[PDB]
Structures are given as C-alpha cells and as structure tokens.
Amino acid sequence: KPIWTRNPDDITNEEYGEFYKSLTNDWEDHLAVKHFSVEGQLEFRALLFVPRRAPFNNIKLYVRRVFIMDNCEELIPEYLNFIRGVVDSEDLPQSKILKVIRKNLVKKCLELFTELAEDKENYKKFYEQFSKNIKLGIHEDSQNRKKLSELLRYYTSASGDEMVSLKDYCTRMKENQKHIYYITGETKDQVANSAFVERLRKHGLEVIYMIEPIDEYCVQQLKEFEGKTLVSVTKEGLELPEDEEEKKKQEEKKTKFENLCKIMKDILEKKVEKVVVSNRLVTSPCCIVTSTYGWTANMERIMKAKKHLEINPDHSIIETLRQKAEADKNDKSVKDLVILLYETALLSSGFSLEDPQTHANRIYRMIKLGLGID
Amino acid sequence: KPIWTRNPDDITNEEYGEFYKSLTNDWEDHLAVKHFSVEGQLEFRALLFVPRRAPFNNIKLYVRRVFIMDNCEELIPEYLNFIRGVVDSEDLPQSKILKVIRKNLVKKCLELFTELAEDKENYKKFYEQFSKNIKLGIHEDSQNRKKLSELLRYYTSASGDEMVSLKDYCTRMKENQKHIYYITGETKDQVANSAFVERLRKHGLEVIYMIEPIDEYCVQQLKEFEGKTLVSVTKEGLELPEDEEEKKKQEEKKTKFENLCKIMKDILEKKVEKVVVSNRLVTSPCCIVTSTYGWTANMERIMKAKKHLEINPDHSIIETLRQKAEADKNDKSVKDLVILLYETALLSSGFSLEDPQTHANRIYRMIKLGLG
Amino acid sequence: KPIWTRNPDDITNEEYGEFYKSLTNDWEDHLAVKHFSVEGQLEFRALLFVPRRAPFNIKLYVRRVFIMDNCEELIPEYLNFIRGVVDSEDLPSKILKVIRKNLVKKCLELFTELAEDKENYKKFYEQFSKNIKLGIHEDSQNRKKLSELLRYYTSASGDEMVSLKDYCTRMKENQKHIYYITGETKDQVANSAFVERLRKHGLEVIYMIEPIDEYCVQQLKEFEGKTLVSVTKEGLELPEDEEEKKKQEEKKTKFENLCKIMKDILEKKVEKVVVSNRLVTSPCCIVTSTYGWTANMERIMAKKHLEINPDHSIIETLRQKAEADKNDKSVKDLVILLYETALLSSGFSLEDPQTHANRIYRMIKLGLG
Amino acid sequence: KPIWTRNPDDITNEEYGEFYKSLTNDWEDHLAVKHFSVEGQLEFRALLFVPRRAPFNIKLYVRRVFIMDNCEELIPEYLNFIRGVVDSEDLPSKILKVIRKNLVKKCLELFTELAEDKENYKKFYEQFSKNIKLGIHEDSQNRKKLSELLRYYTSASGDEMVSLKDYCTRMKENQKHIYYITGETKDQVANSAFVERLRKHGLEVIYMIEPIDEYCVQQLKEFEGKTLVSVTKEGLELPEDEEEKKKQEEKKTKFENLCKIMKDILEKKVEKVVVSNRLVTSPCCIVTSTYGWTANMERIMAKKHLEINPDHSIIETLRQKAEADKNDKSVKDLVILLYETALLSSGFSLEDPQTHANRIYRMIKLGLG
Amino acid sequence: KPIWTRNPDDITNEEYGEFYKSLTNDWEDHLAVKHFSVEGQLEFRALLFVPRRAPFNNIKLYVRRVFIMDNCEELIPEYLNFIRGVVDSEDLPQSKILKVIRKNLVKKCLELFTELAEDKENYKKFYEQFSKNIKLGIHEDSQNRKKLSELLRYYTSASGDEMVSLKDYCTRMKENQKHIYYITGETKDQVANSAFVERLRKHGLEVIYMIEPIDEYCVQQLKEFEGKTLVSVTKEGLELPEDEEEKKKQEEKKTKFENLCKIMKDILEKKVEKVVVSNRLVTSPCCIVTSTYGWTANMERIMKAKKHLEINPDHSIIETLRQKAEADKNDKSVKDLVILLYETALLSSGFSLEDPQTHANRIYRMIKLGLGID
C-alpha cells in the first residue's frame, strides 16, 4: 500500500512528486528521486528525495510500516541533510545497526548524484544548489572523498564560462605535468588576472579557479585526483613540469639574483621570511606567496602568515634594480623602492597594509619626484 | 532574615561578597553593590550587583520572602542585563506593576554608576568591562540618554593614553568652538594619524578617537552633549571656528582651484560626486570624505556611499597639478596622476579598491618612469 | 508558482480557502483574506488570513525558501489569531520591525474594509473584539485606528451595537465628553442611578459590559478630540446653562449642613459626601473617586463618596428632620440605610449582610406591629 | 560518609540544616526533618525536610550514586513542598510505588509528631494546611490520617483553631453529625442565620473560611464514624426529643398554607418553600439543595429553597395576614422583600440591585411621608 | 584568582577536592586530578577530575575567565564523559578549534590514566570503575586504541585471581607463540573449565578470560597488541605454535578420522557446516566452534550462527565410534549417538537446544538401555 513499498517501475513521477510535496509541505515537487531496498543483513526499503532548492536530519523512520521517529540523526551525515524521505526497516530491535542503514543511504545518494551528472545539461540544477554540501562532504567524509570529488565542477583557465570536472581537467593535462594547479579567491576575474597565474597561463598549463569560500576548506582535504596531487599557486615553491634545460636556466637566474635577493630580504626586515627568484611571473614584477603550512590572503580575509616575496628575473624593473642595488647597497632610494615594491605586491596579492597612510606617503614622495620636485 | 531584608549599614562587603558568590556561582566577588528600598506607592526591596567581568533578566524575584521566578522579561532593559541580584516585593495580591520596579531599578543603577565615577581607580575597572552597555543604552534609552552620556569615556587627541569624559572635552573647548569633533576607525594610531585630523590637531581643536565598533551605532543617537553638537571629521562640510580674516583667505583658494576642481571631477567622473578645496588637511595633498546623508568607510567595513575628494590648496603636488592641468586639461598624464591621487586617497580613507591589480600596475608604470 | 507569489486578482476564494485550510488544518475556510505586497525599502509579499473562530503563527519565507514559523516578532501578540505566510526578496533584530509595521498596517486596513460591510462585520467583531481592545491597551501607535473598530451597546441604540463615530454624530452642540459606564449586564447599567440625569438630558451613554472593557478604557482616553468619562466616578462635567450653573449652587449649601452631618455619622464606611448632579429619581448613589478602585474593578478580584439627590423627597425630608435635632436612632437608622442600599445599588458587598438584613427586619417589624 | 547514610542519632540540627540549606539554596534552615530507613522488601534510606515557607523535588540515589532529581512519582503532588534525598541499595514503574508509599507513610508520621508540639505546630499548619486539604481531596488511602491534621475555627473555640478530635470530645450524647459552614469571614459565618438554632442547642459548628475549604469538604465525608453536614443546605438532621418531634409537626402544616402560597408568588426566583428548623431570631434564609451550587460555591466563578421561621413574629403576622385575602401589593411587597433580604443574607447577588434598592425607597418613603 | 589559573605546584589536594565537590555537588572528593595548559595554536588551561564512582558531556567552558556553557559535546568523546572539570580558553572566536581542544584533553586524560597505572596498587580503584569506558574507547577511538589497550587488565589462565596487563601477557609468551589467545563468557570458572581451553592450558599457553559482555564488543576492534594478533579460542581454525612434528602428527590424525568426519557431517545434516578433527581438546570428546565471521554462543545469548563440530582424535569415545561407524555407516544407534554427542557439545559450548524435550527423550532412551530395558 504505502508508496515506498511499491515497485519503482510502477510508481510514476506525478505520484512521487505528490508524495513528496505531502511529506515536506514543499510547494513544488522533488528534483530527483532514489528509491531502493537492501537485503540480508538488515532488510529495508528507502525512498529518498532531493529538493529543488537548498534548505536554510529529517528522514522519517518506520519499522514494519509503523512510524517510529524522525529526529534520527544517525541515518545520514550532516552534509546530506537536505535529503528527505522515508526509511522502512523490516525490523530493527547497543543500537548501531543504524550505521549499516546510514552506509547504504550514502551509497545510494552518491549513486543518485553520479546519475544526475551523466545527464550533462541540468546537472547544473542540482550542482548550483548543493555543491556546498558536496564540498563539505569532501572535508569530512574521507571514506567517500574520491566519489564525492568526481562530482565537483569548477571554472578553470581553460573552461571559459563553463564549469568543468576534475576528470576533464586531467584529460587535458600536458606531458611532464604531474600536478593539478588551483587558485582560491573572491572572483573569476580577480584570479584570472592575478600575478600567480601569468606563467602557467602563458604555457597552457590549466588552473582551477576556486572562487567560493568553502573551497578554502575543501582543498584542505582534497589532496589528489587520479593520483595527481593538487597544488596551490599562491604558496611557496610552485613546482612545474621541468625541462632538462629550464632547470638549468632557473638555477642560473637564481644565482644571478642571489645578491639582490639578499639585500632585499635585508631591508624588508621581519616583514618577509624569504626573498626568492620567482618561477610563476611574466609581466608582474614581483608577488607575495605564503608558506606550505600557514594562512593565505583569502584566509586572513576570512579571519574577521609567513610571506615570501618572489621577484621576477626577467622584469626590467627588477633587472635594473639588481644593477642599482649591487652598485649601492645602503642607498636610501633603493630602500624606499624595495618597500614600495613590497607594499605593491602585498596589495595585488590579496593582503592588507599594516599602515595605509605611510604607504600613501610613500606614493606621494614618488609622485613629487615624478612632477620634478625635490 | 535574608540579607536583602537587612539594613545596608549592618552589612559588610565581605558579607555582600559572600552573598554574591552564592547567588551567581562566581569565583570572585562583585565590583559594586546597590542595596535600596523603594518606599511609597509600591514598596519593594532590591539588592543589586555589578560583576567584575562582563558575562557572555537575571534578577531573582521575590514576593514577601518567597521565590517567584528568575527569567523575568523586562525587570531591566537588555543593556543593563549584566546586573544581578534579587527583588523582594512587599505586596502582590505581565502587568504595569513591573514598570514601577523597572524605572526604580534603572534609576538606582545609573545612580550607582555616577557614584562609581568618583573613585577614578574603580571606574576604570567598571568602564573597561561595561562601556559597550552604556553605549548600547544611549542608542535605545532616550529617557536616560543624557545621564548615560556623562558616563562615557574616550581617547582624544588631547588625552594621551588616558581616556577622558565629554565634560573634560568641553572644559578645553576653544573660543567660538560650537562642535564636538569625533572620528571613528579601527585603531587609535590609524585615526590619530589620518589625514582628516591634520588641521584640527594643528589648531588645537580636540578630536575624539572612537575606536570601538559600537561607537558607529552609538553616535547614530548621541546627537549633541551639553548644548554642543557632535560632528564626524570624515564627512562633508567640516565647520570650524574661523576668524573674519581666515574666511577671506579660504575663499581665495576656492576660486584659485575652482578650475582644477572642475577638470579633476570630469576625469574622476563616476567615482566621485564632488571635488572641493579642503579645509581639514595640512601635510596630505587630499583625502576622501563621505556625503552627510550617505555612510562611511568604517561602516562599509563593519558589514561582514557618496564620496567627495577634498584637495589641499597649500600642497606642492596640488599647486603643481593646477599648473599642469590648466596648461592641458587633456594631458593623459594629468589624468593618470589624478586617478593615482584618487586611488591613494581612497586607500588612506579606509576604503578598499575596485581592482588592486590596476592600481598596482599604475604604481609599476610610474616606478618604471623614474628609472628609465 | 506558490499562491502567495501569484497575482491576487487571478486567485479565487476557493483557492485561497483550499490554501488556508491546508496551511492551518482548519476544517472550514478562512473568514477574511489580505494579500498584498511591499516595495522600495524592503520588497516582500504577505498572505494573511482571519480565521472564523478565535483560538486558545506565520510561516516566514525568504526567496521562496522556508526559514521558520515561530518568529516571535512578526505580528504583535494581540493580532496572533492571524495565520499566513510572508515571503521576502532581499532578507539576508532591526529590520523585522519593518515587516511587523507593514503587516499591522494591512491588518488594520483589512479590518476597516471588513467594517464597511455590516451584513458580515458581526462575524468578525463577535470573535475578535477582545483582541481589538487588548490592542488599544498595548499598542499606542495604532490606538486611534483601533478604536474606530470598537462597537458598543449604548443608551441610544437598543439591541444594536454602534461605533464611536456613530456616537459622535449624535452628540449635542455643547457636549465636550463621551460618557460610558462599566457593569456586568446591559439592563443592570441602563437602570443604574448614574445614568439618570444624563439620559433625561439626552446625552448618550455607552454600556461597556465585558470585563475586558474595564481594562481597555484605562488607555482609551479620547476620540476625535472628545475625552471619555466614567459615570461611576467623582466629578462629572455636564453641559450647563448660565441658569443651571446658578441653581446647582443652591443645593451645595442648602445641603452642605446635611453633607457635613451625614459623613460625620458614616466614618470608616464612606469618606466625604457632596451634592450630586447625576441623579433624578434615585435619592443616593456611591461614586468611586479617581485613584480608588470602582465597584466593577474591585469585582474582578474602596474609596467611596456618597452623592445625595437635592430634588428628592427622601433627601429633602431627611434634611430639616436632621438639621434641627441631629440625633435619635431613627435619623441614624435611615442614613445607614441610605449608605447600604446605595452601596448594593452601586454594585458592592456589605462586610456583613446581616447588619443590613436585620435593619429591613426592624423597618418591616413596625410596618405592621 | 554522606549525611543521609549516617546514623540519625549522631547527626545534629546544625548539620541537618547546613545540609538542608546546601541542598535547596534556602537562606534559613529547615523546619522539620525526618530521617528514616526501610528494610526487607526493598532496602533504602531517606532524608526529608519540611521548608519553613510554602513554595510557588527529591534527589534519587542508588548505592550512593546520583541518578536524577525530577523523578515525577516519588512523593504525590500534594506533598511536593518536601525536599530531600532517597538512597536505594538494590534498585537495578512498579517498584517506585513501593518507595512512594513509604515516603508518604513517614511524612504523615512526621506531621503527626509535629502536631503533638502545639507551641510550634502553628508554624507548620499556617504554611501547609492548604496541602493537607488538597491531600484529603486527591488521596483516598490516607484521607483519614490527613484529616486528623486539619485544624479549624469553630463556634465553641474563639480565637483558636481546634482539631476534629477536639470537636468530638465536645459532642453531645445524641449527636450523630459534624456540622460545618463555608463562608468568607469568621464573623460573617458565626452571625449567619443557619447557625442560630444549632448554637442555641449547644451543638458546635465549624467555620470553614478558606476557599480551599469548599473544595476540600467535597471528599471529607466523615470522621470517627460521624458524618459531616453543611448548615447551608436542605435537610438538616438535629437530635430531637419525642416532644419536639411532635412539635415540629405543628408548624409544617400551620405554615403549609403559607408555604403553598409563598412559592406560588416567587416563581423563577426560588423553587419550593418549607418550615425551617435552623432558625431562631431570623425570619427567613435560603438553603441550597444537595445537587445545586451553594452561595459560596457560586462565588468562586442556583437551586434555592426558602426556609421560613415558624416562631417569628414577622412570619406569624404575614401568615394570617395572607391566609385570609391572599393579595394586595403589600403582601407581595414583603414576600419579595423576604426573598431578597434572605438572598443577600445567605450571600447572593440580585440580578438588578435597583429592584431591591427602590423597594427600600418605597418602605422609607412612607416611613415619614 | 580562580583555582584553574593557579600553578599546580601551589594548589593542594584539599584545595582541589574542595573545588571539585563544589563543581559537582559530589559528596566525596575526586579520585584523580589532571591540571595543565596548552600553548601557541590556542592557549588554554584545563582542570580535569576523575570521580570515585562511575556516573549512571559536562566540562564547564570559560573564555578569558568568563563562563560560556557546559552543554559542549565536542570537548571530549562519549567514552570519557565521566571526566569533570573546567576549560579556560584564552580566547576562541566554522567552529572546529574545539577539535584541537578535544585532542589535547584526550591526550592528557590518557596521560593521567597511564600515571594511575604506574601506581600498581590502587589502579584497581580507577579500573574497576571505568574499564567499561576504556573498552568502549577501544571500540570507537581508533587513533588512541593502542594507548587505550595498554590500560586494559584481564584475568588469564596464568594470573590466578589477579587481573594482568597485555604487556605482561606478552612477556610470558612461549617460543613459536605468535598469537594472543582469548575466550569470552559469563564467568571465570565457566571459561577456565571449558572444552576450548583444555589443550592450550595443558601446554602452558596462556588464555585471556574475557568475562564481561562489553568484551565481546571490545575484541571486535582490538586486533593486535605488540604486533601479536588476538585469536578467539571458540572460533574455527585455532592456530597454535606448530612443531616440525606436530603438523605431521595432525594431518595424520586428520586423514585417519576423515572417514568418520564425513559420516558424522552426513547425519548431522544441516545443523553443522563442517565436522573437523579438533586441535584444542584433551579430555572433552568434542566441542562446537563458530566461524571466523559470525555470531558466538555468547552473542546469541546477548540477542534477546555457522557451527563446526570438532571431534577429539584421542578420546576413547570418538576413537571407538570411528570403529563402529566405519563398520556400519547407516546403523540406527550410531546415528542417535552422533546427535547425542552433537547435542551435548551444543550445551557445553554455550548454546541452547532447538528442542529440549527431544533431547530429553534421547537421554531417556539411553538410560533405559543403561538399566537394561529394550
């Protein structure tokens, strides 16, 4: 009799929808249904629904077609709490059999979501509602992390205005390419045009643009996809596919600017840990990166710390400032220029001036020069 | 028999303290105590305590020595909800009886606070903990707003590392000074060294440093004190005491840069409503102020805006800029300059930029100029 | 797609009702519906229903997503019979009050349209007048709009209940005050001694005969200028001639001797006695000060003034009969008899109803031997 | 080591109190303490305290481990002023009742010892008599032990309140019933018409002058055999001579004519009138049936019988004065006057207190002209 | 000022005890105190107490010496909920920093418990109150399972009436001994005298006697100690240190009784999965064991299934019944004897007869023979 005891092949979409509206006092029908039964260990039937709109535990529990409760937070994990429906156990009596029901429900929900994905138009419709939940699942459900990660969709430097899957990112990977590059910030345009992605983008190396704050917490646990390790492009020591000749070309620029690097680190005092030669810049003269362990600019923005300033070996500014500096180490104008570079990189790398008026003053002095005063 | 029924001369702080710790399960004793009896139309008895530490309403109510309840909506308003103690009514056979109690408690609490504000040592302990509540009450409680305002203490451009009262501010007001000037920002240093206070500081017109967030909510309601209106130093049209001579000197500068203001506004088009000759700057070449009607940069940052660019007529950058722009109002370089100045002033005024990359690129183009 | 976001002029009463019943689990449909929207400030839509029967809340939506029902501060407590939904566009403490003020605005709007159609205002008012009155008591900003919904029986009005607007159309040129009385029965108050001279003068009196009425008029102080006055309390202003103003003077001194001598021999029982201008056929009545509790106030659980009738035979006799030779158990027997009888007639309880009953037994014992 | 497992004879009142105060957050110590143990069936210990002031529960331990305080069924609701601890040895629905019955046994034991010491029973009884009475009402198994704790004012007892045991020592040989009255004041009930003949006969009457009393006596039906009877209700048994039994017959027929003719002209107001054996000096009173609500029952919010006094002058006159020629506005005026006066004297309210007050105004108007 | 902010070296035991009684309205003082502070990541001080008696979350939370709450079930795991005390954070503002506080509290509680253990008289006093909690911890706190397992104490066939640690069990292990043997049942005597332990005990191989029901749930997750894997002696395929000669002696008894094993399995029909030759019996003629995965006799007793009947190669009864049976396979008296053996093993191995009267009848027939009737 009750709808969850009928054979799925029999029940129609109108029928389900009606049951759903009736179960949830929702004004519209479900977005997706998953309706199944498990055998042997425990016997149970389940009818699960995905709402059209994300809510701002509530599976109804039955035994032998008799209502028990629905406070049962043990049936599904926090992150799938948007799921709604009934579980009809063919008899439960410790109390942990509930774990076995939970695992099945997650199995099937993940199965449902995969199927939604294979419908490539209108996975949009689920994903724009529930990707926060996916991502939250990746953080805290280590057992299903891999499956959950196949459901993610992102903007990438290759994707234009489409969100693409990690699987697709992988099939486009280059040859010596060993790593999945990502960036986290507030906007697609803000990251696309960032100093950190200039060189990857010039060489056709694809960057995932993670542009929602949950992403910060998500990448914390998403270490890898298809055995390729995910690397942040705003952290120290960006590693990128090396040629037998670039690795030599690098160490050659490294010891070239080793000197200027040492004088720069000297005056920048305790504002920066290291001053290294960059491997991620083309047009931008320098940038600020943060240590492998630590807080990013995006994270300090959410907080409402170990910096490295990377210089660009091939930028005229840096290049000439290597002349000036090795000519006169303690020179008062190199000093204020070094800070001004630093201060500029700070801003354009997502950070926030310790004192913005001293920075203002620094600009003022410079433009006073510009206009030919002093 | 119970302590609150005893006569306040016969009770010692050691005894009051012991009661308080019993009452509230604290590990330390109270900071202050008010034990009073209202006699007359409705007689009742109250023993009130201020804690030494602000907690993360909570008054026990008794009728004729018999406990009734403690979760009592509107025995005191929310802003005084830190007070703890008991009220023992001598007669009771939701109502309007509670209004009488509520007014009495609120009088005596404000009484206690004024008293505490002698003994300067101890007011520091109280205010350090409960400044927020005093302010929260100025916003909500109009019947008491003036008493609440005399309890306020602030860091000012005159005061050093001590915080002073509004009364004291007033004792130092100049001649022809009609306004109390305040700035609101994140830190004392930030505000004390903001472009907005340069000239007030030079003339020795005191400025109040408002550096807590509640202050933004608070001055929304503290309109004036002791007949003198409070004015923000970051909003348009800063009025100053100005001698007959100086006014004539300010008017010359207005028309001398009447032209530069015009061309600057044209270039800055959509980003600025008005550019004006400043009266508030000395060392800085310009700053950004917000329309009187609109809302600030301190406020924009607390969410977790009509602008004026004021320009310093006595500044080398500005006096040089006049010359260059009047020589060619279309010089792409004058333009690049103006936008630089605008961006830098925007940063200096607590605003965040539209696109910190383009601003950075500007800087770079420049620092590549003065180098080859 | 949901009903509250559909255009109100498309939606029919069977649909509203289907929705109402479905929202509330009522078996009968709603009694009134108000479906409006708001713009500018804060855009939102509301669908509010008035149930047919008094009880003893509101579903809040943001962008068509359910948030909560409980929401303690959406309508004020006196309008909590109202069921419905509010759907907000832009809502991400201080702004709920913006919603609360609009919802109340449109409820009162609804109630005013409801009042226009008499052949059915009855159905509303019988059920929720208590709420209106509780409204006047607790809500100051709308006290005025709320009192125009009040309906009362009056001296002028027989079996119907009329409005204060209505009362006012019937006021007389000189009349500055709206006169009311509080009691337990329509009959009881209409035949009371207080109304007599007012009625004789053609000045309408409102019969307030719910207990709630006693609590409501604490705060309802005026209407269209005019101030309200109980007829059971000391000091009653009454439009007076230059002629009658001269004549009310006569009595307050002719009977002043009696007024000094009557309270003299009634102390502990009643405190001060004056000439009464509210009396025609009755010889005395107790009025109840201004601070002091009234006979109907005290009932739902002190300060009595005896007012005697100048032009009454009983009073005129008992004047000169007392004035010369101020004693004998008989002059005392009647003065006590006037107090007690006046005290029951004004709706009070004698401490001992034997001291009164035995007195009737003395009066009846020598009515025949 | 904890106090409730220590031997009661070691532990001092300062310790009990220190414990009590610490248990309850009272500022003053306990008023009574009962510390007992139980064996056999189910071993357990209890420490129970009686607070000095009435409120407006019990910590349960098993093997010295805390379980819960709330425990809804440890003492019955009427004994919920009692604070304390119960510590059980063997407790691993049906057995809590075994504890509940023992705790009540020892509470009543405590209250009985409390009553032995008069120079302090006052302190208990003033505070918790309401609870005792609520006990009689709800707890049948202990109704008897509970009524021996009841203390009342009586006709016989002046300014003191006595027990029913005490009442019984003063009963007369022939007396089968315990007579009580319910009213609002001691004075009010002692001077009431109902008590007159009982008092004259030397039969003690209990003055029950709390409202709660009205509710309590619903279920308190007897004591030491003797049954209780209200003096404000129809049919009052009274020890009678062979002589007086013959004489009460005279009146019930002499006045039967009047009894037929009096109810004839009082219908809607009162239903049936008989000769009264509760009256001496008063001429009439209303009694209130057996089903029907009484004047004091109706007060905390119908079926009245007029009982007239045979040996009264007013009644004897009004007999033959009516019998021959049964009319004139005067015979009616007095019969109505007897009803109303009898109705206020019995503690009722007239529908309109003007119909009565005007009648006094007719009687007084020709008491002098 | 407050006791948890004072230096432990300063506060006395009387002082702590008093604070404790006052914090818990407990009539007696604490059994143990642990009082510490953590630095850097978050700063906080904590004062934790162990009660004398097991209760039938309640750490009080403070920030900058200001009370916050105590419902905070995130501060310690279910199984340590008997712990009572205060946590004073030097400022907490997501909300998951709580995890970092939790880990510290568990670290320290486990540290406390270890110290209690090193006091070898009067660890009794903690352990008899809280071993259920230890064991519950082993089930569900996989990260600390190893440390938690060092706290366990058991009766063993070697220990007499002392409870001993797994570490001690290990230092007594034999030479080819690779495994920690245990048995679960209701009583020390019931397990000591069980058929399953006869041979281990004859050879000096030590058996842990697990005699509380939580043990059943505990061994479910306690796979190993010091790299030695725990094996149940009531399960199929007891493996025991093999000599170059016993392994041969076994396979020799195996094929000897291979025949009788097949006829026995034949009549015992679907009551038993296998009938094998035993390797755990000396005096007892046979016994019932249950499959590696499955339910034990003890577990079916808690439920208010795959059996193997092992025969004893050296028991006269079995030995002669191998003669009788290979002489007459389908003989009616061998049949009823085979069941009677089975039925007896069922009872003495913790199980419960499907039909006890048919068993009774079986005995009756036998004793009717005994008395010489039939």
Residue numbers in the entry:
A (entry chain B), E (entry chain B): 294 to 349, 359 to 395, 405 to 615, 630 to 699
B (entry chain A): 294 to 349, 359 to 395, 405 to 615, 630 to 697
C (entry chain C), D (entry chain C): 294 to 349, 360 to 395, 406 to 614, 630 to 697
The authors write:
The structure reveals a hexameric assembly with triangular bipyramid geometry, in which the building block is a dimer.
For the C2221 and P21 crystals, obtained under similar conditions, the protein solution was pre-incubated with cis-dichloro(ethylenediamine)platinum(II) (cis-DEP) and cisplatin, respectively, before crystallization setup. All crystal structures were determined by molecular replacement (MR) method, but only the C2221 and P21 crystals were refined to 3.0 Å and 3.05 Å resolutions, respectively, with three and six molecules of MC-HSP90 per asymmetric unit. The refined models of MC-HSP90 in the two different space groups of C2221 and P21 contain nine independent polypeptide chains in total. The other crystals, the C2221 and R32 crystals of MC-HSP90 and the P6322 crystal of MC-HSP90-Ct have fewer than six molecules in an asymmetric unit, but they also contain this kind of hexameric assembly in the crystals, suggesting that the hexamer is not just a result of stabilization by favourable crystal lattice contacts. In the absence of the N-terminal ATPase domain, co-chaperone and client proteins, MC-HSP90 structure contains several disordered regions, which correspond to four functional loops: an amphipathic loop (residues 347–360), a middle segment catalytic loop (residues 395–406), an extended loop (residues 616–630) and the C-terminal tail (residues 698–732). To confirm the presence of disordered loops and C-terminal tail in the crystal, the C2221 crystal was harvested and dissolved for in-gel trypsin digestion and MALDI-MS analysis. In this experiment, the N and C-terminal tail segments and the residues comprising the amphipathic loop, as well as the extended loop, can all be identified in the MASS spectra.
